[PDB]
Design a protein around this ligand. Sequence first.
Ligand SMILES: [Ca+2]
Ligand SMILES: [Ca+2]
Ligand SMILES: [Ca+2]
Ligand SMILES: [Ca+2]
Ligand SMILES: [Ca+2]
Ligand SMILES: [Ca+2]
Lengths: 204, 204
Amino acid sequence: GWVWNQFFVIEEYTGPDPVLVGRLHSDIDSGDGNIKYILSGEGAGTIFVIDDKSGNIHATKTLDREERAQYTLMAQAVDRDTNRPLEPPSEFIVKVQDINDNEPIFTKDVYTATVPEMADVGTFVVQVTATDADDPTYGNSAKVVYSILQGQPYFSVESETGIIKTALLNMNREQYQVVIQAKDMGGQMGGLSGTTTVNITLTD
Amino acid sequence: GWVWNQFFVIEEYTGPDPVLVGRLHSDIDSGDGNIKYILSGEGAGTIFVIDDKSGNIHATKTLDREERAQYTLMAQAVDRDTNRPLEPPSEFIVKVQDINDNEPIFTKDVYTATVPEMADVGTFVVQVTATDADDPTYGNSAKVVYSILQGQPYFSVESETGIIKTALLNMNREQYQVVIQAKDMGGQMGGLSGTTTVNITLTD
Ligand SMILES: [Ca+2]
Ligand SMILES: [Ca+2]
Ligand SMILES: [Ca+2]
Ligand SMILES: [Ca+2]
Ligand SMILES: [Ca+2]
Ligand SMILES: [Ca+2]
């Protein structure tokens, strides 16, 4: 049930010379260059190039996991001269590994909501949503949390759902402007962040 | 006959933060962290460390292919809680990939040989040997070639065997000092190089 037929590459290779992805290899390759490795499939001969005596596969361009996350390719091993079937062809996959190179992005840049005056504490106002394109296989690198910049103590926001509620009894002033931040990494150090504005209007 | 159960690491990681070697993974890992990956064997828990929820394996120190070229490890997948056998344990290997970080090195720093005067052209004199620790799996990165710095036209050297021969008929002067260079990369651009001296003495 193990899985070994895959290699990994980092999103955003901002480096000088092309990078190695992995190496194909048949146990019959005795090191005398009489065996010819061949790529084929998604990206073969373009994004992914192979040296057919060694088996090394290289990434020719810089890849974005948001554009494509996974390339499925084929691996053959033929006889240098006759090009006969030496090893049956087998599939393998290269995974553009994620980096948290995208901030949370509020669907809207401005929300408009209404809530009644003199409402009890915890009255629902509106729910904001910051989407995050980072889709790591696992990890909290894309875990969005909502916090209230401007609006306290009048309003509280729910860290996980972006639901805004009233937080002061018996509310003088008619319109409040709230600012909510969506920070990834679970809000931890170095997390990226986007913001939005919520223009609430009390009602009678 | 294909071989996928191996990862690669570059010799001489002179980089700031530790590097990723590869990732273990069972097809039953449904992404809910209920599966626990385990390392064991050569270097496990020391040189090579694993995060048991992800499966990522990291190189903690910088490795030298001249010291060790190959580490054989084990891979297990158990149930987070019961630690039952979930996937049978399977071997895999990490290969410290070569860089040409070693020059040719003449066994000796000075050779002493004798050859008769008036000898015919091509008379054997001595054979020098420059060893090269770089042992790439394949490639000419460690291909040593011998060239004659000082000694022409009196002597010629064989590019591949480091055999020195007489190259001038009817040889006035009694002792000649020859200098031979051993350059790797097949002598190509950027190849490293070591040298030696050969003090020859003509005879009657
Ligand atoms: Ca990107
Ligand atoms: Ca990304
Ligand atoms: Ca993110
Ligand atoms: Ca070294
Ligand atoms: Ca080396
Ligand atoms: Ca060398």
